[PDB]
Amino acid sequence: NGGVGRCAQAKQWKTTQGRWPKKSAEFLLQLLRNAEANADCKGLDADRLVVHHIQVNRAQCL
Amino acid sequence: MTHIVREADRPGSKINKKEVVEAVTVLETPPMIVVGAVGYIETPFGLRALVNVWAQHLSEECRRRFYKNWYKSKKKAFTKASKKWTDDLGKKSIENDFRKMLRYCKVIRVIAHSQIRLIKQRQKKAHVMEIQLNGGSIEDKVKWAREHLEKPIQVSNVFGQDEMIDCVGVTKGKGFKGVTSRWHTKKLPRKTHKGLRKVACIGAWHPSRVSTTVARAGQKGYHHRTEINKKIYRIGAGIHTKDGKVIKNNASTEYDLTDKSITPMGGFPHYGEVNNDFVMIKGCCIGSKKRIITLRKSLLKHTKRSALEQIKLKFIDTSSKMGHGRFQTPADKLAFMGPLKKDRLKEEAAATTAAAAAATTT
Amino acid sequence: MSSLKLQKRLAASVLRCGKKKVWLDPNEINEIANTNSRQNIRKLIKDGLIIKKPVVVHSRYRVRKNTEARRKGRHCGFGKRKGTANARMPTKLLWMQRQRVL
Amino acid sequence: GGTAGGKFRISLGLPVGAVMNCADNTGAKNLYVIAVHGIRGRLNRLPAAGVGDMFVATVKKGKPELRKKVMPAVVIRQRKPFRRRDGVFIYFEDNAGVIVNNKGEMKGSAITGPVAKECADLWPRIASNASSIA
Amino acid sequence: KIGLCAFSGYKIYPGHGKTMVKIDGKSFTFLDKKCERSYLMKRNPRKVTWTVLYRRKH
Amino acid sequence: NEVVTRECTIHLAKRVHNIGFKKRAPRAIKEIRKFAEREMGTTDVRIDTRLNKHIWSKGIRSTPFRIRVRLARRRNDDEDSPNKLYTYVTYVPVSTFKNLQTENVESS
RNA sequence: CUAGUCGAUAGAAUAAUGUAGGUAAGGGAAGUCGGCAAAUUAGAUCCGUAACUUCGGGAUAAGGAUUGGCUCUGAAGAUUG
RNA sequence: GUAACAGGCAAGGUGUUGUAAGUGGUUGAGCAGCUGCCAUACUGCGAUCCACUGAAGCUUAUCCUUUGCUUGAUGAUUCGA
């Protein structure tokens, strides 16, 4: 978080800093669309779902 | 600020019995509403607020310091703890709470609104302030404050003319400035690489830190200051209809007698329209447009003969501030300039349509 | 729909005014883009779907409102003179003309 | 000295070294401000003469017996405006000075143009020889 | 007290102006800077059509 | 109703002020989009092309001090979108904006 | 104008210090190692021009005056006589 | 506050530049077509000037004022002794 700009919508998180990482959101939309799609396969009710365990890692730098 | 001629009343200066053209300031002070009474004791730590008694009804203008969102709320302060004046209370609630100031306390300060909706701003949310009473035998101070709960007090009873007021406010914000503006440091030459409006040296080798005596980029604008020894030249009282419409000796005097008002032509620019009472001090209190300057009475003695005299002012300049005033009253333009191609040559259409209105019924 | 990068380059080399001045009909780009040969694009040009977008008027009105006022000398004072007098009319070509007169 | 009452601060328009008219009828035609006559000073700051501020002068393009000497002089009018104490802001058409001994007595007998009131009030001898004060 | 603008013809309430002294000896009150500048460019006031002197040319 | 078409004047120089020249007036066509979404509530603001031709009439730098624009908030015909409404602002040529009191009555 | 491009990562906002460009009362080099940097002058027609000189120059020395717009007048030629 | 309000418009006010386009002019150097037989003439000439004209522009974007037209709530996130 250095040197990320401060804002006011990051009061709710209780940390004065934060950004709006557009394409980082939209790769996780396009994942939770695909995690929800297998939830509809087995017959899980999609509205009773919580994000239980999410993690991000590294890959081979290009 | 608005520029006053007067005739100076000194001993052997060089302006004696002569005229000077002074700069004055206008503070629109609509009457404070006093709303509650606080006592303080002494501890070996300093004073300490002990009791707090509020009046029961408070204006909706001035229960608005207690909220940061008022449109959104349910307006529930002071709804519960203002019922203490309506229960028994005569053995239990409040007469005890006024007993406590008679005995324990030493300093009784009083809480006051400001009726800021008379000022015509977009603000609509008040300013609460603790004013200390300073009249003897604090048995008096608790009865003075028990009289004037919920009742207004106006600026003519606090101050007089020819007193030395003090002004306590905030200055005007400039921003993150730099060093030849914050501290007014020299400029480095035109041959200065990497920056000339700096301080060049920032310290010695040793003490090998930087000190808090060096000039850095540390704020300009918006500091608290108190300024002493402004002198009140006039106290306005300017509203309305004592028998008929009344504005006269607001900006009038005994050498002018056109009666108008302190507000120039086209208003005070960015500042207002002033209709209410005003205190008119000497030159320059602090701040921007529409600040809350509180005026405290002077802490000190005045024996300087500049501080002591009474001056009655000759003239109050009510010409515009919005570019360069040429005339004083709006009917002073008709002394110089008569019929502009306007409602002086639009009346001659307005007179014949009213004659066509007279030709309508006939 | 499609890119008429090809379709424009063939138009400006058929009309022979380069493609600053080519107009392809912008409601008929579906039907323009199906056409690849130039013999298939003169048919779109004889028909009214590709036009040659005429030249800019660089009007000569004021140029000859002025040089009818020079004939009366309206703009030749000493503050409209910037050549040395030998440059405006070379005196070698006044004594050339004068000798040929005599 | 001789400053009667409070001579209020006016704006100084003549630093070291400016060149003033010598409105004198002595023969000097320029006066050049070497230095002004009341000045403590702070660092880097140039002394500067107001109206009725006596100073130290040389005549640069004058007479032969007034040149290459150091003499006193008094400013009688300047071109940068100055607030008089009744809201007036007077300035003049060009700057001018007057050769004076150390007492305050003039050197010549005429002053060719207006003397400001500020100069006349402190020097009564320049006041007497004046054409039109203020 | 109330003084007269020398270029135009307006009144000058106290404060409100600058005042020029030529070394003729004469003193000139102007009302604005606009009048003061426009005198030093020698715009004659009979010819500037917002004045009093142009206005007394009717 | 939600289909109303409202004709109103807009003081432009009030808005493209504080902005350096040669940045207006492609700024003045953003300030128009801010003007419509405060007057018709919608977000999809379409600007009639003739208005853009009018704004770029006096170059990038100079911009007309006041315009007389006519917004029409219509329901989004096709392309089923979140925004069911969209405002279309067209250019009205008038002579003198003086005493041109804005009004909503535009049947056409 | 003809042809040719708007491709230089885009939006918001205009703090400090900057790189680049303007203007600034009064004074005018006091600044500085030093007028560095900036400022002034500048095209054209007519006047006019100093020391010194290798007689060629110096010299655009210096120092001045003029100039827009509009409506006119005069002078300069060609083929036919 | 279904409007104690408010935003956008508009009207005033104050300013600022300095007399708008437009017709009309006995304002206009002068020159022409006809200048006429008389009446003695139009202008397509033509910088300017004048009237309508202190007009016209701009005027809060960090100016002032409202019984003028217009518009409006209709979200989101967290929190107890």
Write out the DSSP string of F2-22.
Answer: ---EEEEEEESHHHHTTS-BT
> Is there a cis peptide before residue D17, judged by omega within 30 degrees of 0?
yes
At B350, list the tokens.
């307005």
Nearest residue to B293 (alpha-carbon basis) of B306, B278, B311, B274: B278
Interchain CB distance below 8 Å, D85 and B14: yes
What distance lies between CA D59 and its chain's CA centroid?
Answer: 13
The reply to whether D2 touches chain B by the CB within 8 Å rule is no
- Angle of the B139-147 helix axis to the B95-103 helix axis, nearest 10: 150
Other CB atoms within a 10 A radius of the CB of residue F73 amount to 22
Amino acid at B50: L
What residues have CB less than 8 Å from D33, skipping those under 6 apart? D14, D15, D16, D17, D18, D19, D20, D49, D55, D56, D57
Q: Report the largest interatomic distance among the alpha carbons of chain B, rounded to a whole angstrom.
A: 102
Distance between CA B280 and CA B162 in Å, rounded? 10
At D80, list the tokens.
């940068």
What residues have CB less than 8 Å from B289, skipping those under 6 apart? B270, B271
Distance between CA D91 and CA D118 in Å, rounded? 12
Q: By CB neighbour count within 10 A (0-12 exposed, 13-18 middle, 19+ buried), where does B249 fall?
A: middle
Q: By CB neighbour count within 10 A (0-12 exposed, 13-18 middle, 19+ buried), where does A1 fall?
A: exposed
Per DSSP, helices labelled H in chain D are 117-122, 124-128
What residues have CB less than 8 Å from C51, skipping those under 6 apart? C23, C25
Distance between CA B328 and CA B285 in Å, rounded? 25
Distance between CA B239 and CA B205 in Å, rounded? 66
CA distances for B139 relative to B92, B100, B131, C3, angstroms: 20, 11, 17, 94
Q: Which own/partner contact pairs does D65-71 have at CB distance under 8 Å and 24+ positions apart?
A: D65/D27, D66/D26, D66/D27, D66/D28, D66/D99, D70/D34, D71/D99
Strand order across the E27-29 sheet: D82-83, D89-92, E19-21, E27-29
Angle B104-B107-B111 from CA coordinates, rounded to 5°: 115
Distance between CA B285 and CA B24 in Å, rounded? 10
At A40, list the tokens.
């509809």
At B242, list the tokens.
């004592």
User: Which of E13, E23, E32, E40 should we substitute to test contact with D (largest number of D Cβ atoms within 10 Å)?
Assistant: E23
Angle B256-B258-B262 from CA coordinates, rounded to 5°: 90
Nearest residue to C16 (alpha-carbon basis) of C43, C37, C38: C38
Distance between CA B276 and CA B31 in Å, rounded? 9
What residues have CB less than 8 Å from B206, skipping those under 6 apart? none
Interchain CB distance below 8 Å, D88 and E24: no
Other CB atoms within a 10 A radius of the CB of residue B250 amount to 24
Distance between CA C10 and CA C17 in Å, rounded? 11
Q: Which own/partner contact pairs does B104-107 have at CB distance under 8 Å and 24+ positions apart?
A: B104/B39, B104/B41, B104/B50, B105/B39, B105/B40, B105/B41, B105/B50, B105/B51, B105/B138, B106/B40, B106/B41, B106/B42, B106/B138, B107/B39, B107/B40, B107/B47, B107/B132
Q: By CB neighbour count within 10 A (0-12 exposed, 13-18 middle, 19+ buried), where does C51 fall?
A: middle
At F47, list the tokens.
């600007």
CA distance B77 to chain D (A): 54
Residues linked to residue D90 through DSSP beta bridges, in sequence order: D82, E19
Q: Is the dihedral of CA B21, B26, B32, B38 positive or negative?
A: negative
What residues have CB less than 8 Å from B357, skipping those under 6 apart? none
Distance between CA B157 and CA B151 in Å, rounded? 14
Distance between CA C67 and CA C31 in Å, rounded? 52
* The residue to which tokens 């030159």 are assigned: B283
Distance between CA D14 and CA D73 in Å, rounded? 13
Resolution in A: 3.5
Distance between CA B328 and CA D6 in Å, rounded? 33
Distance E48 CA to H42 C1' (A): 36
Residues F49, F52, F56, F61, Cα dihedral to 10°: -160
Nearest residue to B28 (alpha-carbon basis) of B104, B117, B100, B129: B117
Give the side-chain half-sphere CA count within 13 A for B235: 15
Please tell me the total number of residues recorded for chain C in this structure.
102
Distance between CA B249 and CA B235 in Å, rounded? 10
What 8-state DSSP symbol labels residue F57? G
Assess contact for C23 and C36: CB atoms under 8 A: no
Assess contact for B39 and B100: CB atoms under 8 A: yes
Q: Which own/partner contact pairs does B92-95 have at CB distance under 8 Å and 24+ positions apart?
A: B94/B53
Nearest residue to B148 (alpha-carbon basis) of B33, B29, B30, B295: B33
Range B279-294 burial, b when 16+ CB lie within 10 A, else e: bbbbeebbbeeebebe
Q: By CB neighbour count within 10 A (0-12 exposed, 13-18 middle, 19+ buried), where does B30 fall?
A: buried
Q: Which residue of D has its CA nearest to B12?
A: D5
Distance between CA A44 and CA A52 in Å, rounded? 14
E32: chain B residues, CB-CB within 8 Å: 324
Distance between CA C64 and CA C66 in Å, rounded? 5
Report the Cα–Cα distance between both ends of chain C, in Å, rounded. Answer: 79
Q: Is the dihedral of CA E19, E21, E27, E33 positive or negative?
A: negative
What distance lies between CA B132 and its chain's CA centroid?
Answer: 18
Distance B297 CA to G76 C1' (A): 96
Distance between CA B180 and CA D56 in Å, rounded? 34
Distance between CA D129 and CA D126 in Å, rounded? 5
Please tell me the total number of residues recorded for chain D in this structure.
134
The reply to whether E15 touches chain B by the CB within 8 Å rule is yes
**On chain G, which bases lie within 7 A of the protein's CB atoms?**
1-5, 11-12, 14-19, 25-30, 34, 36-37, 43-46, 66-74, 76-78
At B299, list the tokens.
């802490």
What distance lies between CA E46 and its chain's CA centroid?
Answer: 12
Distance C76 CA to G58 C1' (A): 35
Helices and strands counted in chain E (H then E): 1, 4
Residues linked to residue F45 through DSSP beta bridges, in sequence order: F87
Distance between CA D46 and CA F76 in Å, rounded? 75
Q: By CB neighbour count within 10 A (0-12 exposed, 13-18 middle, 19+ buried), where does F86 fall?
A: buried
The H or E element that residue F46 is part of is strand F45-47
Range C10-49 burial, b when 16+ CB lie within 10 A, else e: bbbebbeeeeebbebeeeebeebeebeeeeebeebeeeeb
Angle D90-D92-D98 from CA coordinates, rounded to 5°: 115
Interchain CB distance below 8 Å, D5 and B5: no
* The residue to which tokens 């700009």 are assigned: A5
User: What is the residue-wise DSSP string for chain A?
Assistant: -TTPPB-SGGGTTT-SB----HHHHHHHHHHHHHHHHHHHHHT--GGG--------------
At B347, list the tokens.
């009346």
Assess contact for F49 and F29: CB atoms under 8 A: no
Coil, helix or strand for D21? strand
E13: chain B residues, CB-CB within 8 Å: 315, 317, 319, 325, 328
Q: By CB neighbour count within 10 A (0-12 exposed, 13-18 middle, 19+ buried), where does B232 fall?
A: buried
What 8-state DSSP symbol labels residue D103? S
- E and D interact (at least 3 Cβ pairs within 8 A): yes
Range D69-108 burial, b when 16+ CB lie within 10 A, else e: eebbbbbbbbeebbebbebbebbbeebbbbbbeeebebbb
Please tell me the total number of residues recorded for chain A in this structure.
62
Nearest residue to B185 (alpha-carbon basis) of B177, B197, B195: B197
CA distance D133 to chain E (A): 9
User: What is the residue-wise DSSP string for chain C?
Assistant: ----HHHHHHHTTTSSS-GGG-EE-TT-HHHHTT--SSTTTSHHHHTTTEE--PPP----HHHHHHTTTTTTTTT-STTS--S-HHHHS-GGGTHHHHHHH-
Other CB atoms within a 10 A radius of the CB of residue A39 amount to 15
E31: chain D residues, CB-CB within 8 Å: none
Nearest to B14 among D6, D44, D87 (CB): D6
Amino acid at D66: L
Interchain CB distance below 8 Å, B317 and E13: yes
The reply to whether E25 touches chain B by the CB within 8 Å rule is no
* The residue to which tokens 């409209």 are assigned: C80
Helices and strands counted in chain D (H then E): 2, 9
